[PDB]
Enzyme design. Structure first.
Site, mmCIF file in Angstrom:
data_model
loop_
_atom_site.group_PDB
_atom_site.id
_atom_site.type_symbol
_atom_site.label_atom_id
_atom_site.label_comp_id
_atom_site.label_asym_id
_atom_site.label_seq_id
_atom_site.Cartn_x
_atom_site.Cartn_y
_atom_site.Cartn_z
ATOM 1 N N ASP A 121 0.830 -1.196 0.000
ATOM 2 C CA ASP A 121 0.000 0.000 0.000
ATOM 3 C C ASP A 121 0.869 1.253 0.000
ATOM 4 O O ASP A 121 2.023 1.239 0.438
ATOM 5 C CB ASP A 121 -0.928 0.000 1.216
ATOM 6 C CG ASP A 121 -1.918 1.146 1.196
ATOM 7 O OD1 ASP A 121 -2.811 1.147 0.323
ATOM 8 O OD2 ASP A 121 -1.803 2.046 2.053
ATOM 9 N N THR A 133 -3.165 6.320 -4.238
ATOM 10 C CA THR A 133 -2.317 7.318 -3.598
ATOM 11 C C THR A 133 -0.878 7.266 -4.088
ATOM 12 O O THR A 133 -0.160 8.265 -3.968
ATOM 13 C CB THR A 133 -2.342 7.137 -2.078
ATOM 14 O OG1 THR A 133 -1.906 5.813 -1.743
ATOM 15 C CG2 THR A 133 -3.746 7.360 -1.535
ATOM 16 N N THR A 134 -0.439 6.130 -4.634
ATOM 17 C CA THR A 134 0.932 6.024 -5.122
ATOM 18 C C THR A 134 1.111 6.796 -6.424
ATOM 19 O O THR A 134 2.092 7.529 -6.594
ATOM 20 C CB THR A 134 1.309 4.555 -5.315
ATOM 21 O OG1 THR A 134 0.411 3.945 -6.251
ATOM 22 C CG2 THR A 134 1.245 3.807 -3.991
ATOM 23 N N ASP A 190 -9.853 -0.797 0.943
ATOM 24 C CA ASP A 190 -9.798 0.222 -0.099
ATOM 25 C C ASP A 190 -10.815 -0.048 -1.201
ATOM 26 O O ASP A 190 -11.248 0.887 -1.885
ATOM 27 C CB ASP A 190 -8.390 0.296 -0.687
ATOM 28 C CG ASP A 190 -7.342 0.647 0.351
ATOM 29 O OD1 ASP A 190 -7.712 0.835 1.530
ATOM 30 O OD2 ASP A 190 -6.151 0.736 -0.011
#
Length: 505
Positions: free
Chosen positions: A43, A76-77, A369
């Protein structure tokens, strides 16, 4: 030195740390602290949240990723990789005697054009289709890395989020509880209608299964209660060495008689219970649980509609909670209490299984998620083609708008288009395919008349229509990532003065 030149380098180092971890395949990192604990995961925010920052401007990068997790979740990455290219291209552009002010206008104006242009590239779908939602969850769980038993988990997570769909459109995530526990395989995961309390029973003599029970909470001790107002205990018997012992047994044996008079049956105390008191409660047959987390008493009352009461004396009927079928059976491990709220169901839980605790912790974050990825889709109702097929199209269409602009700002708009073309290269680098030879192939396949869904598949390793493969995702992850990236850079490019002012609260 101009100081500002050093602030740009502090942001690139953070992007490289989480650059080779995107896509289905990718080597994960490992964390280590001074204590000795070790944990691995793929994550995004889970890793940056543990990194020890040092520079002040470094916190501005992780700040954007933190706000993206609370909104949707996954994606988010990529938000950090796209922002990294904007800083690298700006360095070469700024070095050419280009003021950093006009550069901000290029990204700001270019970001606004791509926002409305991407809206037309998306496609509308149903708001409750049992076939489209199954493909959305496949790309989410696959991104974290879990090619073992995912085809079945997709149909389960989609069946639970469907019950949370309110009568207006909004989607809530608090009504989806997660439970982790060892077992034997990943296929043992199932969806429970009620809740799940992972605790042991105080006495085996209590009933094993009872129907038509009555929920009753108690977030406080259960024993003799002291006087609230200024007073003193009343006791003057000669043999006081046993009176206080019998008083406790009476409070646990007599007060329960009045509690059941209001329709109660089972109990759920917070703290422990007297030793001798458990003997009478065992023969009477009253379910109870000692030492329970405060978070557990909140989800039950919020889902069942009960009231958290602390005074054992004031326990009326309205303070209780309806029930339907309570049981504390066992299956693959220690027994667990299964409270079914069939009278007013709202929240559900998912019991995850596995071979080792180190494995279930990875998929535990993917299913979490997935709720936000699929949840927002039911609220909006419009997905796009994933796999870099939507981003590669903007890099070719934004150049047409730059031709209309004149001046030095035009050069900054062209750099934004090339900088955005960063997700399809790193996606193939970690897989094994070339990093340049394949880029020209996808560019020719989607030049103009080509479909708006062509990308790249790491499995087969060849250009093809990604829409047919079923790799899709909602536009809420891209519309918010690009919007925050264009605004985050404005904080680092504008700031320049660094005053060491102490005492700022």
């Amino acid at each position: 030195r101009d100081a500002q030149r050093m602030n740009i380098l502090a942001g690139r180092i953070i992007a490289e740390t989480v650059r080779s971890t995107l896509g289905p395949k990718g080597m994960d990192k490992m964390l280590v602290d001074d204590l000795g604990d070790v944990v691995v995961t793929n994550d995004g925010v889970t890793i940056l949240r543990e990194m020890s920052v040092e520079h002040p401007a470094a916190k501005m990068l992780i700040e954007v990723a933190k706000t993206q997790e609370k909104e949707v979740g996954d994606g988010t990455t990529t938000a950090v990789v796209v922002a990294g290219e904007l800083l690298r291209k700006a360095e070469e552009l700024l070095d050419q005697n280009v003021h950093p002010t006009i550069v901000v206008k290029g990204y700001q104006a270019a970001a606004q054009k791509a926002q409305e242009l991407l809206k037309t590239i998306a496609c509308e779908v149903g708001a409750q289709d049992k076939e489209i939602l199954t493909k959305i969850a496949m790309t989410s769980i696959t991104g974290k890395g879990a090619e073992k038993a995912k085809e079945k988990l997709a149909e389960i997570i989609v069946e639970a989020v469907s019950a949370v769909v309110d009568d207006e459109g909004k989607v809530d995530k608090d009504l989806i509880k997660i439970e982790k526990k060892s077992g034997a395989s990943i296929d043992d995961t199932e969806l429970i209608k009620g809740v799940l309390v992972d605790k042991e029973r105080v006495s085996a003599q209590m009933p094993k299964k009872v129907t038509d029970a009555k929920i009753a909470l108690l977030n406080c001790a259960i024993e003799i209660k002291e006087t609230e107002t200024d007073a003193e205990i009343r006791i003057t018997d000669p043999a006081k060495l046993m009176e206080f012992i019998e008083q406790e047994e009476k409070m646990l044996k007599d007060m329960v008689a009045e509690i059941k008079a209001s329709g109660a049956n089972v109990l759920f105390c917070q703290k422990g219970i007297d030793d001798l008191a458990q003997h009478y409660l065992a023969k009477e047959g009253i379910v109870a649980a000692r030492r329970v987390k405060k978070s557990d008493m909140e989800k039950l009352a919020k889902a069942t509609g009960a009231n958290v009461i602390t005074n054992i004396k004031d326990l009326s009927a309205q303070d209780l909670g309806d029930a339907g079928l309570v049981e504390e059976r066992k299956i693959s491990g220690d027994s667990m209490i299964f409270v079914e709220e069939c009278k007013h169901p709202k929240a559900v839980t998912m019991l995850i299984r596995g071979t080792t605790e180190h494995v279930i912790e990875e998929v535990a974050r993917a299913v979490d998620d997935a709720v936000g990825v699929v949840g927002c889709t039911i609220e909006d109702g419009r997905i796009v083609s994933g796999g870099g097929s939507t981003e590669v199209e903007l890099s070719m269409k934004l150049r047409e708008y730059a031709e209309g602009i004149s001046g030095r700002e035009q050069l900054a708009v062209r750099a934004f288009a090339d900088a955005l073309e960063v997700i399809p290269r790193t996606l193939a680098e970690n897989a094994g395919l070339d990093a340049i030879e394949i880029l020209v192939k996808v560019r020719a396949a989607h030049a103009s008349n080509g479909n708006k869904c062509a990308g790249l598949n790491v499995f087969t390793g060849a250009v093809e229509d990604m829409c047919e493969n079923g790799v899709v995702e909602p536009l809420r992850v891209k519309t918010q990532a690009i919007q925050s990236a264009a605004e985050s850079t404005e904080m680092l490019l504008r700031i320049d003065d660094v005053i060491a002012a102490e005492k700022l609260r």
